[PDB]
């Protein structure tokens, strides 16, 4: 008769578009020497519940015969990182994955429970080289999706953090402000503290503009090293890739996970409310197992992407 809520349903056509896109991305990735891996369907809930978007409330769980609590694949990056740990031959490593993760969503909201994703991870490789390889690939991954109008954004976890320290160190508060772009709240915040003008002219600006020229000034005027430093990094990438596609810098970008090291990026489609692609650097995870290394990768939200390809068609 009928299906449960948590179950997603793809039209025969949808399956063709999904498989189409995989084929292209499959050539692209393997052409760049990225080995596909298929992480296990179940993981010990422990592994996940060791990272503070890692809330047990969104995970499907059950008890295994041995009596432990296992959970349905919830994230692709974690497993692939573990895999890198196994190798003692401290060498470079390129992984890719095509599949879905399972999270819990509210009913009647039209939200997806089953999330198909396609993404990659780069472990070991040198810092500089990696960051350009990933950013580059991501851009290529984006012409492959039949999306007409799309914007690519880059940000820095370092610049963000620096911004939260100088702002009286009220990170928890400015985080929420940046997330909702609470101009009004921000204003009330600037009032309560003796913030510089250069910090003030900055805070109010990074919230609503990506104009390189305008931003560049504001940043240098703060005469803060860490801030100008992180901004310049983004400026380079902006320039090195500007030919492939116009890069947009978002200094008001809030790092998704607490372990995001520095670089980070998102990519939106005019026909989708959620990013179609997202990623960044996260060497921290690596240290949860083996030693320090330089990770980085991105993930493609197929559910969002196909939804866009549809709207875009009308």
């Amino acid at each position: 008769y009928l299906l449960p809520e948590e179950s997603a349903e793809m039209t025969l056509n949808q399956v063709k578009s999904l498989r189409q896109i995989e084929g292209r991305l499959r050539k692209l990735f393997s052409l760049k020497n990225y080995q596909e891996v298929m992480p296990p369907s179940f993981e010990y809930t422990q592994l996940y519940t060791a990272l503070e978007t890692f809330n047990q409330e969104k995970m499907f769980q059950f008890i295994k015969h041995e009596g432990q609590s296992i959970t349905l694949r919830y994230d692709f990056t974690l497993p692939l990182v573990r895999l890198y740990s196994q190798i003692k031959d401290s060498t470079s490593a390129r992984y890719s994955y095509f599949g879905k993760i399972f999270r819990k969503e509210k009913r009647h909201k039209g939200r997806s429970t089953e999330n198909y994703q396609i993404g990659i991870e780069l472990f070991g490789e040198s810092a500089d080289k990696s960051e350009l390889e990933i950013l580059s690939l991501a851009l290529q991954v984006i012409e492959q999706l039949g999306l007409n109008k799309t914007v690519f954004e880059i940000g820095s976890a370092k610049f963000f953090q620096r911004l939260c320290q100088l702002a009286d160190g009220s990170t928890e508060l400015l985080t929420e402000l940046l997330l909702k772009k609470d101009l009004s709240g921000l204003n009330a915040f600037i009032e309560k503290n003796n913030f510089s003008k250069e910090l003030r002219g900055l805070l109010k600006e990074i919230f609503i503009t990506n104009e390189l020229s305008r931003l560049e000034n504001l940043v240098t005027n703060t005469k803060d090293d860490v801030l100008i430093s992180s901004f310049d990094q983004l400026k380079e990438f902006s320039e090195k890739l500007s030919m492939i596609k116009p890069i947009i810098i978002d200094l008001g970008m809030v790092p998704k996970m607490d372990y995001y090291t520095d670089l980070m990026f998102k990519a939106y489609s005019s026909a989708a409310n959620q990013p179609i692609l997202s990623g960044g650097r996260y060497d921290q995870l690596l240290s949860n197992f083996q030693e320090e290394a330089f990770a980085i990768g991105f993930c493609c939200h197929m559910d969002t992407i196909l939804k866009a390809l549809e709207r875009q068609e009308l």
Binding site: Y1, L2, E9, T11, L12, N13, Q14, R107, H108, G110
Partner: peptide
């Protein structure tokens, strides 16, 4: 070629109806 999207103030009555109708929808 896709599942019918129905908007209603009554999810239960709507799910129950298309249940007898032997059709799967998205409320």
């Amino acid at each position: 070629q896709r599942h019918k999207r129905i908007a209603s103030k009554y999810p239960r009555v709507t799910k129950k109806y298309f249940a007898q109708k032997q059709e799967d929808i998205e409320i």
